[PDB]
Write a protein that binds this ligand. Structure first.
Ligand SMILES: [Eu+2]
Length: 601
DNA sequence: CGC
């Protein structure tokens, strides 16, 4: 258990000043903030907690306001006394997801510096797939300690209390323990993080520096036109009605556009071959085969897609606009993917269809405020260039070197013919091979994407490996070190542990082998993208130009740049992205601009 | 992930 005896509750300036003096001389100290909401931009600071040493932590309530709440130091007085310490780059801080804490302080004109250790990121760099990297999971994993849960003090359901409604002492037990546990977690993980220069490098120079830039991107938000979004919605309703009619008109009667129920009773009952097509799916889509000649399955295909899109983005996005800023603030996750790439939610910017006309209309709703323009900076096929570097292949390297289209260059070599004459079907075959290799695609999966028979796909792969020998070496060498040491690394030293590499189970092990080939390339892209963000944000912070970094999705960074400064700024972003990251992989940055995200894209 |  945890009583009111463990940690102290600071209710007076004199005691707060005694603690600030102790904090000033501590080598590092843990700190956490408590608020009345998860929404960073509109949340109010309810209190703060600190920990100077294991077992020694305190809670400073500043805004609890339930009926008859005891006097507390005022939020303004507490912050002005704490400000010097918080803004001191030399006073080192530890915390669980400091991104959140940095933002809250920003709501009060305070610039959190000394953002040295994030236990969430410590855990993530040590072993990204060890489990969840939230504090409750961390405490139980590294300390066999079960923390007080937020529900334990606030409750559940709609009648859950906000932090300011909880009693001083209850709040104190919770907040002070977090600070305490965080420091203990750091003390256990920080030493471990040094047994290897790779992970240590990524944590120190990539992850940690990225904490404040992610906070700034999240707090900046993105401008979204709800009118455009609504037009699109109304139109889609009309297109869904029409499409349904087109389906009915083709056969007879009414029905759901649900397979293995209403479709099979129609489609194969009027000629075709029995099996269905799962919405397993990105390998066998029976419905889009028939689509090249058959009309019905083609309309059902396009119907489902528009249905998904409308409810996921057209109807959701407008509801995500924040009343305080009038912008949408997406949640970026730094410690979630196995490979190290950032992920996104509310909205999940990465699920907006790219090569689909409708997804483009979603992107047009992402606009620039008056006098500004949206600028998109993207790393052209970064993972493909990374694979070229990793395989040391002179052919692939030279293709990128002389500005030729790698897919046409690849097909020119694989099919043995002039570059100017390679056909679209040949370029399409080479493209499938090139991207298949990055995911470690089996010679049969390639056959299912290209629609060619098995062994005809194999015929192509053998010709590829013979023309580009260095790629097979990489594949073999990577599957080798994966078994020998249970993990693979990126160019910067980031690791992906593969427990199922010697699984003794068939497919469970196959998966581990696919991850072995893929992760080094995907993780390296992520490391590169993270370094560009840090580099770009540094310039932004020092030079103060008229530009905001507003998004990060796939291999691109999106900004809002003033119309009168677009040229000078584009020159600068470009140089930062293709020169101040890794000097080994041959990188190319495509910069564009427009009135909205789709125009610059 | 964070209250
Ligand atoms: Eu907390």
């Amino acid at each position: 258990m945890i009583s009111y005896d463990n940690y102290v509750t600071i209710l007076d300036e004199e005691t707060l000043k005694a603690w600030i003096a102790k904090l000033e001389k501590a080598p590092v100290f843990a700190f956490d903030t408590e608020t009345d909401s998860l929404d960073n931009i509109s949340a109010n600071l309810v209190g703060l907690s600190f920990a100077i040493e294991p077992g020694v932590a305190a809670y400073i309530p500043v805004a609890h306001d339930y009926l008859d709440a005891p006097d507390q130091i005022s939020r303004e007085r507490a912050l002005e006394l704490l400000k010097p310490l918080l803004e001191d780059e030399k006073a080192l801080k530890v915390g669980q997801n400091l991104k959140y804490d940095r933002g809250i302080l920003a709501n009060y004109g305070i610039e959190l510096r000394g953002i040295a250790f994030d236990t969430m990121l410590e855990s993530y760099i040590l072993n990204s797939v060890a489990g969840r990297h939230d504090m409750d999971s961390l405490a139980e994993r590294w300390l066999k300690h079960k923390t007080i849960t937020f529900e334990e003090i606030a409750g559940k359901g709609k009648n859950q209390l906000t932090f300011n409604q909880i009693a001083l002492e209850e709040a104190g037990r919770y907040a002070a323990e977090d600070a305490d546990v965080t420091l203990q977690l750091h003390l256990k993980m920080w030493p471990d993080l040094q047994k290897h220069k790779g992970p240590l490098n990524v944590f120190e120079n990539i992850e940690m520096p990225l904490v404040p830039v992610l906070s700034r991107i999240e707090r900046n938000g993105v401008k979204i036109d709800p009118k455009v979004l609504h037009n699109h919605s109304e139109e889609l309703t009309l297109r869904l009605a029409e499409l349904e009619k087109k389906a009915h008109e083709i056969a007879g009667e009414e029905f759901n556009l649900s397979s293995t129920k209403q479709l099979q009773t129609i489609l194969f009952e009027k000629q075709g071959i029995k099996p269905l097509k799962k919405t397993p799916s990105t390998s066998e889509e029976v419905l889009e085969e028939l689509a090249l000649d058959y009309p019905l399955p083609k309309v059902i295909l396009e119907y489902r897609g528009l249905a998904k899109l409308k409810s996921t983005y057209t109807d959701k996005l407008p509801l995500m606009i924040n009343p305080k800023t009038g912008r949408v603030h997406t949640s970026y996750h730094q410690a979630v993917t196995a490979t190290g790439r950032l992920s996104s939610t509310d909205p999940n910017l990465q699920n907006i269809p790219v090569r689909n006309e409708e997804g483009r209309r979603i992107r047009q709703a992402f606009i620039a405020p008056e006098d500004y323009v949206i600028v998109s900076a993207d790393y052209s096929q970064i993972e493909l260039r990374i694979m070229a570097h990793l395989s040391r292949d002179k052919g692939l390297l030279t293709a990128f070197a002389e500005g030729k289209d790698i897919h046409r260059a690849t097909a020119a070599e694989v099919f043995g013919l002039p570059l100017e004459t390679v056909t679209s079907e040949q370029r399409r075959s080479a493209k499938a091979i090139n991207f298949g290799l990055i995911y470690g695609m089996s010679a049969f999966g390639l056959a299912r994407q290209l629609n060619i028979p098995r062994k005809e796909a194999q015929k192509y792969m053998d010709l590829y490996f013979e023309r580009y020998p260095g790629v097979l070496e990489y594949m073999e060498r990577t599957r080798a070190q994966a078994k020998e040491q249970g993990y693979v690394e990126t160019l910067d030293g980031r690791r992906l542990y593969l427990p199922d590499i010697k699984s003794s189970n068939g497919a469970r092990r196959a998966a581990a082998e696919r991850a072995a080939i893929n992760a080094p390339m995907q993780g390296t892209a992520a490391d590169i993208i993270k370094r560009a963000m840090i580099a770009v944000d540094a310039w932004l912070q020092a030079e103060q130009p008229r530009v905001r970094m507003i998004m990060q999705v796939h291999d691109e960074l999106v900004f809002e740049v003033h119309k009168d400064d677009v040229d000078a700024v584009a020159k600068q972003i470009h140089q930062l992205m293709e020169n101040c990251t890794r000097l080994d992989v041959p990188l190319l940055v495509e910069v564009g601009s427009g009135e909205n995200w789709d125009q610059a894209h």
